[PDB]
Amino acid sequence: GAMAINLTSEKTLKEASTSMAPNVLKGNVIKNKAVASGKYVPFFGSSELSRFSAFHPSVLSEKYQRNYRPFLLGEAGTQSLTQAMVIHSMGDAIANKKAVFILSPQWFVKKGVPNDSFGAHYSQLQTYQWLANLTELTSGDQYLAQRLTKFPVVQKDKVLMETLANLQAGQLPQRSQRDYFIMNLRFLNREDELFSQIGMVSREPIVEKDMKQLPATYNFNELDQLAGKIAAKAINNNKFEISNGFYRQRIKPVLPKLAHSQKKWDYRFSPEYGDFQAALEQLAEKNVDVLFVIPPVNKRWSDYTGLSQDMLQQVARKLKYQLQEQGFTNIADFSTCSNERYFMADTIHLGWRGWLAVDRQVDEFMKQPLAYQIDDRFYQTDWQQQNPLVLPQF
Ligand SMILES: [Cl-]
Ligand SMILES: [Cl-]
Ligand SMILES: [Cl-]
Ligand code: NA
């Protein structure tokens, strides 16, 4: 590629920070440089990150010229296992820095992350890099190996499967296995440099458009009221306070079938609790200070689908126990805000007033001036299947 294509330029990092480009998520050059600079705070999440408005953290941070910008990492289908490898691949770039982790209760389904969701975001670069540089084996490495062998995208990689088998047996990758990954990494790193920007569509034009809606100076109460007025315009074609486009495209054509459709849904038991532990161990190993966010589900929608808000509180209690028990004490739990109007953009994605509330917690967290106690037993099936009614309220 032409030398003028500078993947680490200031403009490139700025443009990529709001793109949610999966090729950047699967790569190393761009995302690692952004986080290593200290100016970009990685936002680990999924599809909710794209719900932009005047009150999205990417817009508020640009409008008021803060000393940091979010770097959105995730999309639909990127859960904890994918993110654990994203975090690990940053290496020392994220060490001793700050991050934001947006949990989705919907991640914690009975069977965990679907095969196609993990496969669609599987990074051979990051996975091969992890195995090539492995010099000391940890329980987290063995848990990652065990989980990866369960997905078809990995099972078709025989050398990888053979290497993951040794990890589970307590052995480092064999010399011939490490050499193999190193051979391929020469191609994978070159392809990262050449192709990681294909399909990148920055949301900077949306940022600059929404900035024109915000006052010149920041005031939460003013913004909170303004978010209600703007939201009220964009949810007027239905009674569930759902965005017009989202509603007419996904809800309206099948509205009768969705009634009571979620009465039996349950997020209390899931392999995702183990995959989430994998991300927590990676963050703790690099001394990353993290703010965790738990969103609600719109009360007006859950009343129609039958999704249990009591069950969602059981899920929050389980997650906050796993966090607090191990030293993760920065938690913005908005799961009790289900009845807050204009909080969500649609059914499950944070919206106008939700992002404003998250933005305040993020901003306060970034101004805050680590005693982690990782417990490997959170990887075990008995925790994945643990009923949270016995847990305390941390
Ligand atoms: Cl501010
Ligand atoms: Cl819309
Ligand atoms: Cl309920
Ligand atoms: Na989500």
CA distance 111 to 135: 32
Q: Is the dihedral of CA 356, 362, 367, 368 positive or negative?
A: positive
Backbone angles phi, psi at 280, to 5 degrees: -65, -40
Q: Which ligand is nearest to the CA of 308?
A: 3
CA distance 281 to 147: 15
Q: Which ligand is nearest to the CA of 305?
A: 3
CA distance 354 to 363: 14
CA 215 to centroid of ligand 1, rounded, Å? 12
CA distance 82 to 246: 26
Looking only at the bridges linking them, the beta strands covering 69-73 and 98-102 are unpaired
CA 164 to centroid of ligand 1, rounded, Å? 46
CA distance 51 to 245: 12
CA 308 to centroid of ligand 3, rounded, Å? 4
CA 106 to centroid of ligand 3, rounded, Å? 16
Residue 17 CB coordination number (10 Å):
29
CA 354 to centroid of ligand 2, rounded, Å? 16
Residue 266: name the closest of 392, 163, 387, 362 by CA: 387
Which residues hold their Cβ within 5 A of ligand 1, which is an ion? 64, 218
Q: Is the dihedral of CA 226, 228, 232, 234 positive or negative?
A: positive
Backbone angles phi, psi at 44, to 5 degrees: -85, 120
Q: How far is CA 227 from CA 27, 224, 343, in A?
A: 35, 5, 9
Q: How was this structure determined?
A: X-ray
Q: How far is CA 277 from CA 18, 41, 47, 169, 322, in A?
A: 27, 21, 21, 20, 8
CA 81 to centroid of ligand 4, rounded, Å? 15
CA 306 to centroid of ligand 3, rounded, Å? 7
CA distance 291 to 328: 8
CA 20 to centroid of ligand 4, rounded, Å? 13
Nearby residues of 121 by Cβ (< 8 Å), 6 or more positions away:
22, 25, 26, 75, 77, 78, 82
24 contacts 31 by C-beta, under 8 angstroms: yes
Q: Which ligand is nearest to the CA of 67?
A: 1
Residue 276: name the closest of 142, 121, 113 by CA: 113
